Amino acid sequence: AASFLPSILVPLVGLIFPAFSMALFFLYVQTDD
């Protein structure tokens, strides 16, 4: 059901996504090509 989507996506968008993005930026700025 689509109604369950708010409770399945918000946890991901506000927690999982930001974390991985920040991690990637760190790895990108800490690397010496």
Next chain:
Amino acid sequence: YIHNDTMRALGRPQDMFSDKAIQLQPIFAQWIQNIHLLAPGTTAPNALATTSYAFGGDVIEVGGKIAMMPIKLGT
């Protein structure tokens, strides 16, 4: 303070640091107050009353207005 503000705004008053919830009492100060209140006649035998009514005692009123009263300490 910020914690409490957020909690009250989110409708969760039971999670605040208050005297009606999680409480942070000033135990040390409360203790000293009692010591000073009971001093007259004990640790200060020749005295007749508390140095200040703030520590404890009765309410001194002059002209229908309160001059001094015990000041209590809480969260």
Next chain:
Amino acid sequence: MITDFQVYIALMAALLASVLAIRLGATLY
């Protein structure tokens, strides 16, 4: 009333935009 299928279709479209966005970003890089 937006049906579940309709909502799911929208999500699929969004995914296409995302993949096409990464490429544009990587092409500008």
Next chain:
Amino acid sequence: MIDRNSKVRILRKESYWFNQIGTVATVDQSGIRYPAVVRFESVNYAGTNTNNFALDELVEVK
């Protein structure tokens, strides 16, 4: 003409005293790049009242 005690107007755009009048103190004759030494009555943002200029940067006023 530029000469001792002559009064001239500065023509160096970078000078604090551009388009202003100064008095030539001495003009060196040894071939230095900026021979004339002009003195002003107003201090610059640094507090100096003198600077050395070339003859072309100075026009006699009288």
Next chain:
Amino acid sequence: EIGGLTKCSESAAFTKRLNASVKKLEQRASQYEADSPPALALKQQVERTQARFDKYSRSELLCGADGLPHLVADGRWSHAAEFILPGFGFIYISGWIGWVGRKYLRAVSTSANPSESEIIINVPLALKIMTTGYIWPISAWQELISNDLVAVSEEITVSP
């Protein structure tokens, strides 16, 4: 009237304000008594209040709905007392001050120490120069047409 306003002499709100103001002072005076210094003062104050409102009433001031005087400044000479006439006063006095100041600065500029005379004013000279400003309008115009007021690109300018 201009702007839909009403003359203050014919505005009920204006009168209501007057009555109310006086009443307040009188109520206060009641507490004090007879020739008590406090009462006499309050009594004198009401007189001034009554006078002020009366003056405004006899004037040509136009009041609004609030019963407060509103000033007109569009150039009409009917209400010149409100802005034009007082305006001339400011211009005359201001010009006087500016003119005399410029005169003194230029005068002491050629002295032995032009900077000492700015921190320690030569009172005698200043007074003389100050008195000569009553005809500043004439002097200024004369100086303009004599090319002695405005300078000519012989002044310092920025690099660009």
Next chain:
Amino acid sequence: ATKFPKFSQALAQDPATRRIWYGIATAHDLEAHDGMTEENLYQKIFASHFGHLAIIFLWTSGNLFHVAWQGNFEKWVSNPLKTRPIAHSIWDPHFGESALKAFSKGNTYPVNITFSGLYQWWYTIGFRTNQELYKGSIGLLLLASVLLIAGWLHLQPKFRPSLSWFKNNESRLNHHLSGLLGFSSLAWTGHLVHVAIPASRGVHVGWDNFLTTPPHPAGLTPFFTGNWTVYAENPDSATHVFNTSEGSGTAILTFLGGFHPQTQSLWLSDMAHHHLAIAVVFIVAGHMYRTNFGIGHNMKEILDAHRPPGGRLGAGHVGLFETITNSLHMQLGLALACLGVATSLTAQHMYALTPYAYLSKDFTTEAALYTHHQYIAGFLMVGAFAHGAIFFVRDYDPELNKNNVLARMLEHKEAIISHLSWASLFLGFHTLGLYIHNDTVVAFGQPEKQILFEPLFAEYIQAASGKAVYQFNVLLASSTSPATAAGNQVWLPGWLEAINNPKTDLFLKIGPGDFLVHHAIALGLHVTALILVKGALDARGSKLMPDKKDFGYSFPCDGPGRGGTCDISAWDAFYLAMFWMLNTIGWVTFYWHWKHMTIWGGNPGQFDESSNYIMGWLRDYLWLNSSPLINGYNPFGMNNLSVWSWMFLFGHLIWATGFMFLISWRGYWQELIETLVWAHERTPLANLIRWRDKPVALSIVQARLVGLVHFSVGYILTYAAFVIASTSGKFA
């Protein structure tokens, strides 16, 4: 480079944390990147624009989707004046049961009420069902994808446009004026005539029947025959109920003037006619420049020939053509300036000539929209002047523009700056002085001694258009005026009704109180301008630093010598002007809100009398109308205004935090950071972990930027809460 700032070796080889900070903030200055050719610059910018467009469309798609999936549009359509529009739903795991109930008031699930005005706009344009909104969102998602593809395509080797294509001014202007603006307007009038107007009268015209439902009974016969008057006959009656056929008409193009009686908004037929006329004007104007067909004007020639014979303007406009074509910064400045004026106009004209139905009755939304556009306008204005300065420092060629109109501006720079200064001083001293006089006399209990000037000039203008209260018998306010006779049988009938109706915002009544506030706004504009203009003119050099052009647009300072040279760069002018911009916009927004608040509340007198002195603003506006907001959450409970209450306090925090960066400078912090480094290196266990980027304090300019951002964000956020909670809490 081989580090984060690939576009800068200098930053890349930096051993500190600055490398990261600066790389992020110098990312979009493509012109300064290492190894940048003009061709590449243009190509990358073009592609970046495609991406921006896509973001805008995705944003619009989301609003439609969320309103359609979680909103109450259809219910609102049924009862527009008794339903609160919903934006999106709320799923916060931190909420308490009480909050779930409070925010779910009026509905069955926690929700946020929209103050963006989308419902009214969509209702007016024709939307009636949620399914329709869904289709729109899906379409925009698709368009967004197409735009992203274009960005990639034009960065490919065989599709990268040439530098010449990017500099063909004539073709672009012709196309943009005739097609982007002209034909688009023609298309819009088509929609209004085919879909919107029918809907207002109760008929449904959609993709299902548009090809078989003629917009007008006569057909296109009158159009081609020349009998255009037919399309203006039978306008909707004054008893027409919107969204229904009762009292409807058949007219499609008219010039009635005024507002629909029931919706209190502009007639749709008039808007259609408006766009049709604008269309023709733009389409004709788009045929002015030469574009490979022989006919047309050459812009360079036009500019060169315009030199006043008297010589008062020097050599005229010769040389400007090359300067503009070869400078992207000047182009951006010109654009931002014009858009800034447009945004302000939208705000000013949209609250008076209400364009959408039942928008006037939604007080909170009306308030938000005005403050929104006015603030955006300020930012857009400041940016224009900023890029103008960047131009002088980077792209100005002194030789090309010899005795040009532009060069001569930089010749009398002192005159301009000095006179602008005088204006600011005059306005400042007297405006403040008069306010303080009024405050003192009132405080002493003598309000009758206040200096209140009537705004006669403005009142005259209002009368000139028909207002009668002021009693100035002039122009349209005069029955014998030639002007009245002209439009008495055209558009005046309807206009003269609205302008003379006290329950409309068309030319609101003005009084002594408005005089003062207007002069304060004047001070703001003049002083903000002074800072910005000075920055631009004194960007290439000054007496303190005659070689400023060699250091750039933004540099920390020039040292503690020559008296001290702090904040001497042009960037600093932008920094200083931002504060004034916020102040002036604040004054403007405060004025609009308070005036309207009193009007809506039914006591216009409060503003009329208390606006004359400062205490009134503080007590009768800020203090009085803050009661609903500060009680969003109290020791006794909470309501739907809790979120707004919390944000208000949040704003204050950010604003004050900004002060730290503005007043405290680097030296102190650098020394403190050094001590912290010592500790980490000397504390066992933590010694195991170490940094790879030396920890250092923020730079001088960086701190200024950070501080300005904190100040700005807090400023906007705090007012946003007030304007919304105060209006909604009292009238909603």
Next chain:
Amino acid sequence: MNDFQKYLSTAPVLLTLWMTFTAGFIIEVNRFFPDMLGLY
């Protein structure tokens, strides 16, 4: 005397005296002609 007069001729001192005089005359005018918002 001469030296004291010079001190009295200093900028700060003269300003104070002049402003006191100016303030005084303005106050005195209002004392005798009070409450005016226009030349009558």
Next chain:
Amino acid sequence: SHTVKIYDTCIGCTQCVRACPTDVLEMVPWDGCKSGQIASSPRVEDCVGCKRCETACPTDFLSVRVYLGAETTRSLGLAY
């Protein structure tokens, strides 16, 4: 790191080289001035950007100009 340039308006007062906190400037022989000396910046790799040198110059406009640029450990004065 930073760039220091000397111009022909120098008078060989030596004040600049006596003010540098990191020995970046030197006095070299020259014939364009009466003093017969001009300033040079042989070791700009140690310039911290203090601009004390500029503050010491007596010429109308600085004959010694410091243009701040790329930053290194030395230029950022980092002892850590």
